[PDB]
């Protein structure tokens, strides 16, 4: 509680910038209301970083590249530039597959031009061509070719497009210019949107013409989740046994018939609205196809989802919903029983991309553990509108924080555990505040639905509650 | 399904016969999977010879690089000094990047900061995000030295760091008087090891071009060290031991393993240790300057010789036994300090293990990649114990350096079976591997794809992987081990011969089958 | 037939279709082996409830002990004092067996003499036999002491050392002002720790019993370290800068490290280092001794609290973060030293290292063996880690330390699922591990049988060992590691936490079956 | 070499001993004369070892228990006393065997009754009968018990003859009691005989009126081959390609069956002549089996040894000794031609016990090098008789050699190579002169026929040539 301190607070925490610095950080930290349902006369979102404060923001390439198009196994993506950010970029989301690597799938594997400087001053079109050759030679059971544009290929003047085209048209592929470069947009948002823009362009609409692929009134596309740790598998198993038919996965596990065979499905269940919103639109509209969001983080948000989900279908999909949630129930009542007493009234402070800050608000909540502070590095105003009614009153919310920012929050609200990247882990460690990794589950995972929450649990038990936090101070100190 | 008793993770959940059902229903309706046939008979293909002809010739297209780039090097040379903000002139994403690999790899908070630009300084340039950057990391984190390297973004629109520094100090956005050592780092020359001295020999510079007329070499009676580009703890600490023990003055530059291996007590420090600017203003008065990977270190080479005025030893990396001999006989011969009685036993244990573990190493095919240096030392030290390297990358690599390396190999009995590849990429590695299988590979993380891989042609051609170099991901505390001098030799051999016999207690694990080889003792 | 090229030893060499043909056909010719079906269903009762059942009622059988006999104790005490000979009265084959098994675990030379004892001894005893020796040993090996303990044969027979030794230096075989302490080291009586307590107990009360007039405590500012029996020479080189660090006076009494770590630069040293006998003589005059592994020194605290009139600290074991600490400030308020900031830093970042390992630590199931002091300080950091002790087994162990260990372990909410055995051997362990399957072992080299046995199962029944304790004969200078201290904690952490990562990495290698979950970083 | 300055080295090395000791050591140290055949004449052997003079020497037990009965796989055998012998004792011998260990199988295994104060006070006969009631509780498919007896057994006044033969005529098995007590004797080779005596009262007549096994003319049994490394494997193949049938082998690998099967067949081919010759004469008078000595060291004694044991069959035997004679030239000549030029002219010393310090000098001379020193640690004046005739023009000889005795002596001679136990190896190791492991090949091997001639071959080369010797001065001295 104490809206007035937390106010004075983010003036004391704010004091120490310059005013050009300080006027434009006032803008983006707020203290809740969840009466207030307009963000905009709250908090400003999806601006621009300041420079040198030390932001966790990402790029386009990032969003691109890293999120949507890495995932899809059976395409091959070619880094268009420079050795290093494919390579600070391989296998470091746990976007999971099946498949066998270097033959049909090519997630983990690091594709890039190797751009020097003869590459930089004549340019790289004959190069990336070559590449495609080579690529097509080495790799024949790639299904397609997606190249994802870093700084430099924006700023020489380098005619990607035409390059796929020719290619494509003379080799019978589908090749995916996305124009990703990383000085593009102020986050990963661009990424996200530009990403959606390519698949949009490029292959949702390969087989507008085709109809062999019979479809029946229980077909659904999972849209925006990303299989990190198996989540999209776990709620997938949760959509089939309550009947329903899973077409196509966007795009964890995903292959691109499953991306051009989403137009024939019934209904589109967004797991990531943030970077997914712009194709379930363009579903909308092109081909009438409704979309609806769904959570399934923790037992009462997923029993929820499931319901609104039984309801878009007839009678039958409804039963067997019910008969999921009577299946399911007795296994995460077992998990609560064993896991709330040593959860019980600890307090949270969260500050992740831009989806999971508002989504795993209801989990914690079910262990008995109450959310203090949220944030977001990316997400847009519909968001922060999204978030503002599920959090409690003059809770902390902060936009594109920075390290200092979030250090001092930390340092005056003292919560007991705290979930981020990487990037603060350590941070977070060293002043003996219990840390989860909530980008990667800490290597661990899934957490989405039934299957998930057990291990979220299990998770939150063992790091909140582990001896280490306990012996930071020396006795002799 | 779970149990509360015993609740399984990603692995073995997905294991469970619910789960692999759903699997072979989505691959068998939606994924219009290629037949399993046909996989096997395209991974027998990429295992065979015709597919490494092929591998060779390519030219354009790199698969699986062994390197990166310019600033993370940048980077890592710039947290060796004290109270010092790396800040990168560009984009935001390349900080993200560069800091979420240095966490990965050494488990500690990295600290680093970026002008954040953006379309608007791609047609106008960033003369103000440089400014705006400085005067907020300077009242933001209060640095008494902020050093600035840059990424291809910048590289590429031209942007004049020495201009931009300048007007920022004239304009009062910094004070004059404040410390900004510049370099330029065009990802698309060279690899990190090129940024590390691109940023060393600016701040050099910075720090000694224009105050040169008071110094006298050999002054102050100490030996100026330049580690390079390192990712052991340990090397800085063992190079620090053996200076103290020979009674040898001497001055680290670029120290960072104090900020890299801060305690846990409860406060976090954002600086902790490293080189101040006393040592780097007086580094001129020392006798001497010795570097400690010189194959990337060139451009700090010519700056020392030229400028300072020091005869820089030829000396290779201080890696095994005769390496070592070396450079501390150099360093008694440059300092007159006679070498203790300490570092004599020390060799002897080290010739001690060598002698036991002989007829174990005797023999084994390594396949080896990570930076030339570190390469060439590895190589050299294989060498001695009698093991025979076969595949040799370096993707960092340069003529001279193979040219070097082969004469290191032609010279002993061991190295008639082996070759050396520069530019070439772990997807080269692999094939190699297959075609000529070694025992053992030794590498960063990213070999760990290349067993796998062999494990799928057969138990019979697995190449297990030794985990030495950067970066190692998969393992915790690496990052602590030493490479460098007797104790790092001492500790690679008994990590070499573990892994062997480790292989061979598990090769005749089988009851009845092989176990009539399982050996008590080895 | 071999190929010159590539020659084969037994493995696999004998895995040959014609070899495998000759096994075969010997088998079904003329060993008259039960049927593969019987051999399994055998196998199969052995690995279960009944079994176990049936095996934890022996009271006559001992199957795979984990213990020694007492003079192997002695002579590794006797080999910690500075160039002084352990001998042995009774039979050579004991000295035999001695020295082998120090060679096989040290990788080190290893001296001992014996009387050679033999059928005419039986009816007239070893008077003549220890006159010859101690003649012999003197005359060839110029030692500066000889340390006298007992075989079996002897205790039996009844020699009586004090009188033998008496005699021998009344007649001129010895001078009488040569050093000669002896101990009896009943083999039926504990265990080679026993041993060394004896060994212990006797030099001291040969040094210090019939000069104590003129001792005054605290006069030289000294406190006394006892290690107790150490195989572990990072133990010993940590106890010594630990306590140099803290700038404490101190007096190691019986260190072995130099003698055991010799170079080998072209000449053999039969002496090396040790305590000296003016140290053993100045004990008493410390401020106070402290005893590192308190449970097997009972004697040795008899005799230094009777006699020595030292208050000896009730100090645990320093092993693990918290009797580490309690050790630390024990010998501050001893010494009056304070504990200086390296300790604490050193202490942090071992802190670091667990908070960055617990998620892959945490609920982990070991079994373990070993010597009681070492078993219980393990349990004790396994506990301060979050990882569960389940199988907790001493095969030397008494009652009062297994209610001490079971005081322990209720303390912690980790030690619910934790029972102790004393006097159980490995035989019982491998039953325990088959019927109430643990994550991973903890010993010596004697467990590798018994992850054979559950590799024998299934592969989801194996349980990997890890080597921790005494004797390791399978791997190469594991001798060197350190388990006292930040330092040994910090490799101990290491060790297990890799362990666990190998196993995962081991078990998610399977293409297209298990690999989803081959992560890069971990 | 140089006769005279062998004999000064002598007296030199014996001068720093006491009297009683030099007079005895004068008398075990000689100068070998091939014209001598009585070794009698010039060497002392088979005596007790001077007290604290580090003697290499073993126990009765070890003899016994460790080199005789430890091989037997099918057997369990008991260590009767204190716990430290078959704990020393376990695994510390190469004796390969096939089988599954712990159920039908138990080399490895470590049985003791692991005596306690109470026990060596009140004896331990009844606790041998309830070890064995466990025994055979615990392990049924056990085909045998040995008692194999430590110091305080027969110090105290046990009967473990009684125990044994009521319970061996309790459970109807075989339970032999062996009396190898370590003081007995002053060296193995009572130990050696001890068991031997055991083998033939308590084993061997069992099938004396079993008359339902077939015998063929060809019918031969290996002795004293204890399967070092797969050494006696080794050399059953070539005997199987020679048209012989090898019914038993003792005891490398050997089962209780084969030793009773033993009586029947018509050759007994003796290896070790030391530790076997008593039972080898023992069948010869009572079953009239012929018994002859053979040497599968190298390529050139393994051929004379095959043509000697084809010159006792018919002429087919012969024959196909030709055709493996043949067929193996070539790769032990391939072995020669690769090896010798980097072992030619080097001199090696070797110290070894019963058997090998003759057995190994031809395959030394195969690859072009020179045996200058040997000794024996329990040989008796036969095996010295062998050895003089076996070795060279003044060259050293010793018996029971002592460490200081062999340190001079190397110290003196400066061989490049050394071959003895673990209890040397370091020793010489930290000296700068390589070292060989002659009891358990160091790990490595078989040594034996012509498949082990080349893996000897490559280990001497790999340990001679090995860069490490050439490093232990530092060039700073
Ligand atoms: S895509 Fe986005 S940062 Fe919606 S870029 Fe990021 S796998 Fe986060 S909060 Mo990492 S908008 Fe997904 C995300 Fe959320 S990589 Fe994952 S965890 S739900
Ligand atoms: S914002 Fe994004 S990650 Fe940055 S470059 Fe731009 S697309 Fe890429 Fe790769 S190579 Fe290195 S890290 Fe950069 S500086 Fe040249
Ligand atoms: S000569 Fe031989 S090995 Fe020696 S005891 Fe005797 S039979 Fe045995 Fe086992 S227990 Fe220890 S080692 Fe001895 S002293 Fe009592
Ligand atoms: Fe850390
Ligand atoms: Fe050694």
Chains 1, 4 share one sequence.
Request: hydrophobic residues 35%; negative net charge; charged residues 25%.
């Amino acid at each position: 509680m104490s809206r007035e301190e937390v106010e004075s607070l983010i003036q004391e925490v704010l004091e120490v910038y310059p005013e050009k610095a300080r006027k434009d950080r006032n803008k983006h930290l707020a203290v809740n209301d969840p009466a207030v349902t307009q963000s905009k006369k709250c908090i400003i979102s999806n601006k621009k970083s300041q420079p040198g404060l030390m932001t966790i923001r990402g790029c386009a390439y990032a969003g691109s590249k890293g999120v949507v198009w890495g995932p899809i196994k059976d395409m091959i993506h070619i880094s268009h530039g420079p050795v290093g950010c494919g390579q600070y970029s391989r296998a470091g989301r746990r976007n999971y597959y099946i498949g066998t690597t270097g033959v049909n799938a090519f997630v983990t594997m690091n594709f890039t031009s190797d751009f020097q400087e003869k590459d930089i001053v004549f340019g790289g079109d004959k190069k990336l061509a070559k590449l495609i050759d080579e690529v097509e030679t080495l790799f024949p059971l790639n299904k397609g070719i997606s190249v994802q544009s870093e700084c430099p290929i924006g700023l020489i003047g380098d005619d990607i497009e035409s390059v796929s085209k020719v290619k494509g048209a003379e080799l019978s592929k589908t090749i995916v210019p996305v124009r990703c470069e990383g000085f593009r947009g102020v986050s990963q948002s661009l990424g996200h949107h530009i990403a959606n823009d390519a698949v949009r362009d490029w292959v949702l609409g390969k087989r507008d013409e085709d109809t062999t692929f019979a479809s029946t009134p229980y077909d659904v596309a999972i849209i925006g989740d990303y299989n990190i740790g198996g989540d999209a598998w776990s709620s997938r198993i949760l959509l089939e046994e309550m009947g329903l038919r899973c077409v196509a996965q966007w795009s964890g596990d995903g292959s691109i018939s499953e991306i051009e065979l989403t137009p024939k499905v019934k209904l589109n269940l967004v797991h990531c609205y943030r970077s997914m919103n712009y194709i379930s639109r363009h579903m909308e509209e092109k081909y009438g196809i409704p979309w609806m969001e769904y959570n399934f983080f923790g037992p009462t948000k997923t029993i929820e989802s499931l319901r609104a989900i039984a309801a878009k279908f007839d009678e039958s999909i409804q039963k067997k919903c019910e008969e999921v949630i009577a299946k399911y129930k007795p296994e995460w009542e077992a998990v609560v029983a064993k896991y709330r007493p040593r959860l019980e009234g600890k307090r949270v402070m969260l500050y992740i991309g831009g989806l999971r800050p508002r989504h795993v608000i209801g989990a914690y909540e079910d262990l008995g553990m109450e959310v203090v502070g949220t944030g977001y590095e990316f997400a847009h105003n519909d968001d922060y509108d999204r978030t503002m009614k599920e959090m409690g009153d003059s809770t902390l919310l902060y936009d594109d924080v920075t390290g200092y920012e979030f250090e001092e929050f930390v340092k005056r609200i003292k919560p007991d555990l705290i979930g981020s990247g990487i990037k603060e882990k350590f941070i977070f460690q060293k002043m003996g505040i219990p840390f989860r990794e909530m980008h990667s589950w800490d290597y661990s995972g899934p957490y989405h639905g039934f299957d998930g929450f057990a291990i979220f649990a299990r998770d939150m038990d063992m790091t909140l509650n582990n001896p280490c936090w306990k012996k930071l101070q020396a006795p002799w100190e | 399904s779970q149990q509360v008793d015993k609740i399984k993770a990603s692995y073995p959940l997905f294991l469970d016969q619910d789960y692999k059902d759903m699997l072979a229903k989505k691959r068998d309706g939606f994924e219009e999977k290629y037949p399993q046939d046909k996989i096997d008979e395209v991974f027998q293909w990429t295992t065979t010879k015709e597919y490494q002809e092929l591998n060779f010739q390519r030219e354009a297209l790199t698969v699986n690089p062994a390197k990166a780039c310019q600033p993370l090097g940048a980077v890592l040379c710039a947290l060796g000094f004290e109270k010092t903000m790396p800040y990168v002139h560009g984009s935001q994403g390349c900080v993200a990047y560069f800091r979420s690999y240095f966490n990965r790899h050494f488990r500690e908070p990295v600290s680093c900061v970026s002008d954040s630009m953006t379309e608007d300084a791609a047609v106008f340039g960033g003369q103000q995000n440089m400014k705006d950057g400085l005067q907020n990391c300077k009242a933001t984190y209060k640095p008494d030295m902020i050093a600035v390297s840059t990424t291809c973004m910048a590289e590429v629109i031209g942007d004049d760091l020495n201009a931009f520094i300048n007007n920022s100090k004239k304009e009062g956005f910094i004070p004059d008087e404040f410390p900004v050592p510049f370099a330029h780092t065009p990802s698309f020359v060279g690899s990190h090891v090129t940024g590390w001295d691109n940023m060393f020999e600016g701040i050099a510079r910075y720090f000694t071009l224009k105050s040169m007329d008071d110094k006298v070499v050999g002054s102050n009676k100490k030996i100026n060290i330049v580690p390079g580009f390192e990712t052991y703890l340990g090397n800085f600490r063992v190079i620090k031991r053996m200076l103290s023990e020979m009674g040898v003055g001497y001055s680290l530059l670029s120290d960072p393993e104090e900020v890299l291996d801060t305690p846990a007590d409860g406060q976090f420090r954002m600086y902790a240790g490293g080189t101040t600017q006393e040592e780097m203003k007086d580094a001129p008065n020392a006798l001497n300057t010795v570097l400690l990977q010189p194959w990337h270190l060139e451009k700090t080479k010519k700056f020392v010789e030229g400028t300072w005025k020091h005869e820089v030893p030829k000396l290779n990396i201080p890696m095994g036994l005769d390496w070592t001999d070396e450079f501390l006989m150099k360093v008694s011969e440059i300092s007159g300090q006679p070498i203790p009685a300490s570092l004599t036993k020390e060799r002897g244990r080290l010739v001690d293990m060598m002698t036991d573990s002989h007829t174990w190493l005797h023999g084994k095919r390594f396949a080896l990649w990570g930076d030339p240096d570190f390469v060439m030392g590895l190589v050299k030290f294989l060498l001695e114990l009698g093991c025979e390297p076969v595949h040799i990358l370096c993707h960092n690599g340069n003529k001279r350096w193979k040219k070097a390396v082969d004469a290191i190999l032609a010279a002993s009995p061991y190295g008639k079976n082996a070759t050396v590849y520069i530019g070439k990429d772990l997807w080269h590695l692999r094939s190699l591997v297959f075609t000529d299988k070694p025992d053992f590979m030794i590498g960063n993380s990213y070999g760990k794809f290349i067993q796998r891989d062999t494990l799928h042609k057969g138990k019979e051609f697995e190449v297990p992987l030794i985990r030495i170099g950067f970066p190692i991901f998969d393992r915790h505390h690496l990052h602590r081990s030493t490479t460098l001098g007797y104790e790092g030799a001492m500790q690679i051999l008994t990590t070499l011969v573990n892994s062997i016999l480790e292989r061979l207690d598990e090769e005749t694990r089988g009851m009845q089958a092989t176990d009539y080889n399982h050996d008590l003792v080895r």
